[PDB]
Structures are given as C-alpha cells and as structure tokens.
C-alpha cells in the first residue's frame, strides 16, 4: 500500500516510531479499506 514493507514486524524492528508512523498509517489505511470492502460484500450477500 505504498509502505516500505508489508510486514508490520519488519517496519517496527527497522525504524524508529517517528518515521515508522507514516508506514504504519499507510498500512492501516489499506487494510481498513480492504476490511470495509469485505464487510460491505458480506452484508449484500447476507441480504441475498
């Protein structure tokens, strides 16, 4: 999702918090968007 790596542990063990915050935020945005998409699809399928 634009971050340096897709693994949170690598980001945590490689960078200090002030600079790793941006990467964590990008990962959070991407994963939250994916989860919301999944939940909406599940709601529609559940209605069907």
């Amino acid at each position: 999702f634009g971050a340096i790596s897709s693994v949170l542990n690598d980001i945590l063990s490689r960078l200090d918090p002030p600079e790793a915050e941006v990467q964590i935020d990008r990962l959070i945005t991407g994963r939250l968007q994916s989860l919301q998409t999944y939940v909406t699809q599940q709601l529609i399928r559940a209605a069907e």
């Binding site: 063990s13 490689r14 960078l15």
Partner: protein, 49 residues
C-alpha cells in the same frame, strides 16, 4: 581496515568493499564522538545492532 585506513580513493573512483560472514557492532561506531556525521536512511541508527 576500512574506517581506520590510510588511503581513501578518489570520489569518482570511490572504493567499495564487501562485508559478509562476520558480526558487526554498529553501536560502538554510532556512540563514538569521532564521527561528526552519522545519518541512516531506511533504518534507525539505534536498531542496526
């Protein structure tokens, strides 16, 4: 042999040496007052160890 050396090559012919199969202690380099510039990109200076 690289940090504490006598000859440093020219800028356009910068000398590259490969480091492998050893244990590196970057804390002694970072905490030393001999260096007037120590900045890391893609990693923090305290996490190399």
């Amino acid at each position: 042999e690289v940090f504490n050396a006598t000859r440093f090559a020219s800028v356009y012919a910068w000398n590259r040496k490969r480091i492998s199969n050893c244990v590196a202690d970057y804390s002694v380099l970072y905490n030393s007052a001999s260096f007037s510039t120590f900045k890391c990109y893609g990693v923090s200076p305290t996490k190399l160890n």
